[PDB]
Design a protein around this ligand. Structure first.
Ligand SMILES: O=C(O)CNC(=O)C(=O)O
Ligand SMILES: [Mg+2]
Ligand code: NI
Ligand SMILES: [Zn+2]
Length: 331
């Protein structure tokens, strides 16, 4: 078995190898990359996502989210308070202000220590989940707005034809902005490109051990667990690496820098934080290997997780028993 310790793998495709996205994903899995839940892909040196970022300040963040924490430093939840709209130029100036900017630090490890010590005492503002793309239309390789759709994958593998569309999302971050522990909707893959700015640190649990993280989360967030049988779908819970190590949860960490892709694999729990002002683009995708994960994915029916139009069809076709109750939650 390849990659039996479930380490995060780093790939350096040539420009030739970067032509065929599907083929490269299958390659990475042939080497065991999926076992980690997360892989890094460094694009060939000849590739670029777009010519310059010189003109992005006019993008609107219609609903910036203030991420307010509750709990203790290593075990907390966050709620998202909606803020007034602002442009990316306005958000970047806020990120760089004395109140919100990255503190002085020695290296990524010192910064990680400071994040886990101090996160809960601040409320950074995250411009998350903005439909759009920063890839140039002329970028033909690994252009996250030109991928094969999940609906088309389901049609090719299973014959069934369904409604829905699959488009990318932009994320504008600042110091301490946080993504809570989650898997993707319907345990899909994700791919995330860091277009510019400061790094993003990721933590990940191997898919084969995801249920260990779930059991810990039920112990650490016991009221949330009684409220919903899949409350990590709410995307609000944080657990630090220290706490994971104290409880024997297998995990890995890696820091993504500007210009790099990350892929999350089906049922790979992940969480993390931004080091400073940045912009990422991400989208969900599927392969044939995902189908079985999609059939088995948990679902929030308490009603809180409230997800996309396109997820309806996935549930309806892959999980027809759950359909009914999942849609009672979503209506
Ligand atoms: O970048 C972020 O805030 C969160 N991204 C993801 O969870 C992802 O790409 O799957
Ligand atoms: Mg602009
Ligand atoms: Ni994700
Ligand atoms: Zn729920």
């Amino acid at each position: 078995a390849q990659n039996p310790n479930c380490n995060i793998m780093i790939f350096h495709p040539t420009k030739e190898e970067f032509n065929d996205f599907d083929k490269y994903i299958a390659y990475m899995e042939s080497q065991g990359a999926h076992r980690a839940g997360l892989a890094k892909i460094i694009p060939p040196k000849e590739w670029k996502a777009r010519e310059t970022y010189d003109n992005i300040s006019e993008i609107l963040i219609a609903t910036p989210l203030q991420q307010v924490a509750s709990g203790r430093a290593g075990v907390f939840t966050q709620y998202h308070k909606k803020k007034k709209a602002m442009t990316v130029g306005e958000y970047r100036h806020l990120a760089n202000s004395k109140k919100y900017q990255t503190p002085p630090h020695q290296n990524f490890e010192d910064l990680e220590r400071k994040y886990w010590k101090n996160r809960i005492y601040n409320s950074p503002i995250y411009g998350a989940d903005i439909s759009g793309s920063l890839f140039d239309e002329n970028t033909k390789q690994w252009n996250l707005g030109h991928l094969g759709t999940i609906q088309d994958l389901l049609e090719k593998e299973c014959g069934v034809v369904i409604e829905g569309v699959n488009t990318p999302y932009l994320y504008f971050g600042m110091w301490k902005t946080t993504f809570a522990w989650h898997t993707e909707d319907m345990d899909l893959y994700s791919i995330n490109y860091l277009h510019l700015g400061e790094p993003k640190t990721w933590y990940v649990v191997p898919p084969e051990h995801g249920q260990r993280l779930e059991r810990l989360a039920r112990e650490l967030f016991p009221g949330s667990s009684r409220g919903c049988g899949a409350f990590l779908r709410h995307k609000v819970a944080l657990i630090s690496p220290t706490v994971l190590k104290e409880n024997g949860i297998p995990f890995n960490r890696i820091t993504q820098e500007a210009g790099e892709f990350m892929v999350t694999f089906p049922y790979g729990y992940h969480a993390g934080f931004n080091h400073g002002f940045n912009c990422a683009e991400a989208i969900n995708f599927a392969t044939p290997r995902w189908i079985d994960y999609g059939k088995m994915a948990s679902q929030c029916s308490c009603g809180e997780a409230r997800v996309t139009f396109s997820m309806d069809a996935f549930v309806r076709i892959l999980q027809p028993e759950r359909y009914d109750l999942w849609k009672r939650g979503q209506d």
